[PDB]
Structures are given as C-alpha cells and as structure tokens.
Design an enzyme around this catalytic site. Structure first.
Site, PDB file in Angstrom:
ATOM      1  N   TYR A   5      24.380  42.715  29.119  1.00 60.48           N
ATOM      2  CA  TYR A   5      24.839  42.529  30.576  1.00 60.48           C
ATOM      3  C   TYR A   5      26.249  41.551  31.089  1.00 60.48           C
ATOM      4  O   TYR A   5      26.910  41.626  31.339  1.00 60.48           O
ATOM      5  CB  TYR A   5      23.746  43.039  31.234  1.00 60.48           C
ATOM      6  CG  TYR A   5      24.064  44.747  31.403  1.00 60.48           C
ATOM      7  CD1 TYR A   5      22.740  45.115  31.164  1.00 60.48           C
ATOM      8  CD2 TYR A   5      24.618  45.373  32.317  1.00 60.48           C
ATOM      9  CE1 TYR A   5      22.536  46.424  30.869  1.00 60.48           C
ATOM     10  CE2 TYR A   5      24.296  46.691  32.486  1.00 60.48           C
ATOM     11  CZ  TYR A   5      23.339  47.510  31.733  1.00 60.48           C
ATOM     12  OH  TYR A   5      22.814  48.624  31.582  1.00 60.48           O
TER      13      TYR A   5
ATOM     14  N   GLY B  96      28.196  40.157  29.431  1.00 57.29           N
ATOM     15  CA  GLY B  96      29.616  40.144  28.937  1.00 57.29           C
ATOM     16  C   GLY B  96      30.229  41.274  29.245  1.00 57.29           C
ATOM     17  O   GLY B  96      30.194  41.642  30.280  1.00 57.29           O
TER      18      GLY B  96
ATOM     19  N   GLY C  68      31.405  44.480  30.279  1.00 56.37           N
ATOM     20  CA  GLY C  68      30.653  45.774  30.719  1.00 56.37           C
ATOM     21  C   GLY C  68      29.567  45.772  30.379  1.00 56.37           C
ATOM     22  O   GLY C  68      28.819  44.203  30.945  1.00 56.37           O
TER      23      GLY C  68
ATOM     24  N   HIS D 252      24.194  41.092  38.889  1.00 65.24           N
ATOM     25  CA  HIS D 252      25.557  40.639  38.900  1.00 65.24           C
ATOM     26  C   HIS D 252      26.010  41.951  38.885  1.00 65.24           C
ATOM     27  O   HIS D 252      27.603  42.010  39.528  1.00 65.24           O
ATOM     28  CB  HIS D 252      25.908  39.182  38.586  1.00 65.24           C
ATOM     29  CG  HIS D 252      26.751  38.594  38.599  1.00 65.24           C
ATOM     30  ND1 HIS D 252      28.465  38.504  37.465  1.00 65.24           N
ATOM     31  CD2 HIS D 252      27.178  37.804  39.565  1.00 65.24           C
ATOM     32  CE1 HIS D 252      29.160  38.021  37.912  1.00 65.24           C
ATOM     33  NE2 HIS D 252      28.659  37.213  38.784  1.00 65.24           N
ATOM     34  N   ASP D 253      26.432  42.626  37.745  1.00 66.60           N
ATOM     35  CA  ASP D 253      27.871  43.470  37.142  1.00 66.60           C
ATOM     36  C   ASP D 253      27.848  44.170  38.510  1.00 66.60           C
ATOM     37  O   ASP D 253      28.246  44.889  39.040  1.00 66.60           O
ATOM     38  CB  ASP D 253      27.018  44.247  36.039  1.00 66.60           C
ATOM     39  CG  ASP D 253      27.477  43.695  34.913  1.00 66.60           C
ATOM     40  OD1 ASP D 253      27.920  42.392  34.737  1.00 66.60           O
ATOM     41  OD2 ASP D 253      28.002  44.069  33.880  1.00 66.60           O
TER      42      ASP D 253
ATOM     43  N   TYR E 167      28.897  43.006  41.513  1.00 71.08           N
ATOM     44  CA  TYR E 167      30.504  43.444  41.424  1.00 71.08           C
ATOM     45  C   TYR E 167      30.518  44.589  41.995  1.00 71.08           C
ATOM     46  O   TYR E 167      32.261  44.842  42.178  1.00 71.08           O
ATOM     47  CB  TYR E 167      31.470  42.789  40.498  1.00 71.08           C
ATOM     48  CG  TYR E 167      31.364  41.238  39.879  1.00 71.08           C
ATOM     49  CD1 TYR E 167      30.624  40.030  40.665  1.00 71.08           C
ATOM     50  CD2 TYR E 167      31.833  41.013  39.439  1.00 71.08           C
ATOM     51  CE1 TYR E 167      31.212  39.452  41.081  1.00 71.08           C
ATOM     52  CE2 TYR E 167      32.256  39.361  38.767  1.00 71.08           C
ATOM     53  CZ  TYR E 167      31.919  38.480  39.758  1.00 71.08           C
ATOM     54  OH  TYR E 167      32.065  37.312  39.712  1.00 71.08           O
TER      55      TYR E 167
ATOM     56  N   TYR F 120      37.772  32.018  45.456  1.00 66.56           N
ATOM     57  CA  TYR F 120      36.505  31.561  46.412  1.00 66.56           C
ATOM     58  C   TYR F 120      36.270  29.729  46.524  1.00 66.56           C
ATOM     59  O   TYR F 120      36.657  28.779  45.840  1.00 66.56           O
ATOM     60  CB  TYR F 120      35.641  32.716  46.740  1.00 66.56           C
ATOM     61  CG  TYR F 120      34.702  32.065  46.035  1.00 66.56           C
ATOM     62  CD1 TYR F 120      33.697  31.257  45.743  1.00 66.56           C
ATOM     63  CD2 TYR F 120      34.698  33.080  44.727  1.00 66.56           C
ATOM     64  CE1 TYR F 120      33.171  31.065  44.550  1.00 66.56           C
ATOM     65  CE2 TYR F 120      33.963  32.962  43.785  1.00 66.56           C
ATOM     66  CZ  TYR F 120      32.907  31.784  43.759  1.00 66.56           C
ATOM     67  OH  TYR F 120      31.919  31.398  42.820  1.00 66.56           O
TER      68      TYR F 120
ATOM     69  N   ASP G 294      27.396  35.664  43.117  1.00 68.37           N
ATOM     70  CA  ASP G 294      28.151  34.781  41.868  1.00 68.37           C
ATOM     71  C   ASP G 294      26.846  33.814  41.809  1.00 68.37           C
ATOM     72  O   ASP G 294      26.209  32.867  41.166  1.00 68.37           O
ATOM     73  CB  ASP G 294      29.888  33.924  42.243  1.00 68.37           C
ATOM     74  CG  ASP G 294      30.736  34.625  41.293  1.00 68.37           C
ATOM     75  OD1 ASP G 294      30.211  35.521  41.090  1.00 68.37           O
ATOM     76  OD2 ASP G 294      31.694  34.522  41.723  1.00 68.37           O
TER      77      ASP G 294
HETATM   78  C1  LIG Z   1      33.911  40.333  31.282  1.00 65.24           C
HETATM   79  C2  LIG Z   1      34.077  39.443  30.372  1.00 65.24           C
HETATM   80  C3  LIG Z   1      33.566  40.004  29.078  1.00 65.24           C
HETATM   81  C4  LIG Z   1      35.095  39.183  30.062  1.00 65.24           C
HETATM   82  C5  LIG Z   1      35.340  36.846  30.577  1.00 65.24           C
HETATM   83  C6  LIG Z   1      36.164  35.960  30.365  1.00 65.24           C
HETATM   84  C7  LIG Z   1      37.630  36.136  30.174  1.00 65.24           C
HETATM   85  C8  LIG Z   1      38.236  35.117  30.135  1.00 65.24           C
HETATM   86  C9  LIG Z   1      39.564  34.870  30.065  1.00 65.24           C
HETATM   87  C10 LIG Z   1      40.394  36.373  29.389  1.00 65.24           C
HETATM   88  C11 LIG Z   1      39.449  37.486  28.796  1.00 65.24           C
HETATM   89  C12 LIG Z   1      38.464  37.632  29.584  1.00 65.24           C
HETATM   90  C13 LIG Z   1      34.965  34.736  30.723  1.00 65.24           C
HETATM   91  C14 LIG Z   1      35.084  33.477  30.732  1.00 65.24           C
HETATM   92  C15 LIG Z   1      36.363  32.985  30.823  1.00 65.24           C
HETATM   93  C16 LIG Z   1      36.863  31.038  31.003  1.00 65.24           C
HETATM   94  C17 LIG Z   1      35.441  30.590  31.940  1.00 65.24           C
HETATM   95 CL1  LIG Z   1      36.256  29.430  32.013  1.00 65.24          CL
HETATM   96  C18 LIG Z   1      34.333  31.383  32.100  1.00 65.24           C
HETATM   97  C19 LIG Z   1      34.331  32.177  31.330  1.00 65.24           C
HETATM   98  C20 LIG Z   1      33.494  35.037  31.504  1.00 65.24           C
HETATM   99  C21 LIG Z   1      32.476  35.602  31.541  1.00 65.24           C
HETATM  100  C22 LIG Z   1      31.684  35.479  32.820  1.00 65.24           C
HETATM  101  O1  LIG Z   1      33.071  34.805  33.900  1.00 65.24           O
HETATM  102  O2  LIG Z   1      31.012  36.713  33.460  1.00 65.24           O
HETATM  103  N1  LIG Z   1      33.643  37.014  31.104  1.00 65.24           N
HETATM  104  C23 LIG Z   1      32.977  38.096  30.847  1.00 65.24           C
END
Ligand SMILES: CC1(C)Cc2c(-c3ccccc3)c(-c3ccc(Cl)cc3)c(CC(=O)O)n2C1
Length: 121
Positions: free
Chosen positions: A27, A29, A31, A47-48, A51, A64, A89
């Site tokens: 989870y 990552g 979806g 968390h998922d 949201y 925020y 979060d």
């Molecule tokens: C939905 C995701 C699989 C896509 C994504 C990005 C992401 C970033 C850029 C473009 C597409 C997806 C980042 C993320 C990005 C940047 C930082 Cl500094 C931390 C986490 C994170 C971790 C999170 O917060 O859950 N995820 C989970």
C-alpha cells in the site's frame, strides 16, 4: 502535499520518504491491493483510506502548514481540505514511527503479484 508529508516522515522516522516508504509492501506506493504485509504497510493502508474519505480534496498537491510543539505535530488552520489532509498525514507519520522497529527491507520494492487478497476500509 507530498512536500509536507515527506518532511514530516523524515523528521519523525529519520528515513527519507523516497525510497523508504514509496515502494514498500502492498500500500506504501501507488494504489494498493491485497493484504498489508506488516504494521508499516498497514499504516499506508489506513493512510490510503484516510485520503479516500476526501473525494473533493487534492492531498498530493494541496499544501498545508504544520508546526512542532515540543515534538508534537500541530496542524495549522487552513482550508477544510488542508486541515483534513494534514490530519491524515500526521497519523501516518506517527504510525510509521511506532512501527519503525519492525520495518523490513525485504518489503522494499515488493513485487506486485505477491499482493493478493482483499481488505476494505
Ligand atoms: C502515489 C505515489 C506512488 C506517487 C508518489 C510520488 C510522486 C512524485 C512525483 C511525481 C509522481 C509521483 C511521491 C513523492 C514525491 C516527492 C517526495 Cl519529496 C516524496 C514523495 C510519493 C510518496 C508518498 O508521498 O506517498 N508517491 C506515492
């Protein structure tokens, strides 16, 4: 937004969101499917779901404000969506911290096919 969430996780756990929590288990990552692999993966599941209760908000991009009051996370007053995103979060950061002891590297970059099963929010 992901910017505040990543900063929160790093402060709380000492681990960088990427790549410690962005491809963990089923989870943490993109979806999610199947049964959470462990406590940390359960944190991402919840968390998922958190949201998921915010249909009209945009958790990934809405920013925020939050401050630390002697270690405690305090969400600053903003829009309704921002307040609720921050609470989701904050809970995840605390959950990650409480389960750092069982965090397992074997769940990093976990293969999709091993995520089997069903779990509703
Ligand atoms: C939905 C995701 C699989 C896509 C994504 C990005 C992401 C970033 C850029 C473009 C597409 C997806 C980042 C993320 C990005 C940047 C930082 Cl500094 C931390 C986490 C994170 C971790 C999170 O917060 O859950 N995820 C989970």
């Amino acid at each position: 937004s992901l910017l505040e969430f990543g900063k929160m996780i790093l402060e709380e756990t000492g681990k960088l969101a990427i790549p410690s929590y962005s491809s963990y288990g089923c989870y943490c990552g993109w979806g999610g499917k199947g049964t959470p692999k462990d406590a940390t993966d359960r944190c991402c599941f919840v968390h998922d779901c958190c949201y998921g209760n915010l249909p009209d908000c945009n958790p990934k991009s809405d920013r925020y404000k939050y401050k630390r009051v002697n270690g405690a996370i305090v969400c600053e007053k903003g829009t309704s969506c921002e307040n609720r995103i921050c609470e989701c979060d904050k809970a995840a950061a605390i959950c990650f911290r409480q389960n750092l002891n069982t965090y397992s590297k074997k769940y990093m970059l976990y293969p999709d096919f091993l995520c089997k099963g069903e779990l509703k929010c």
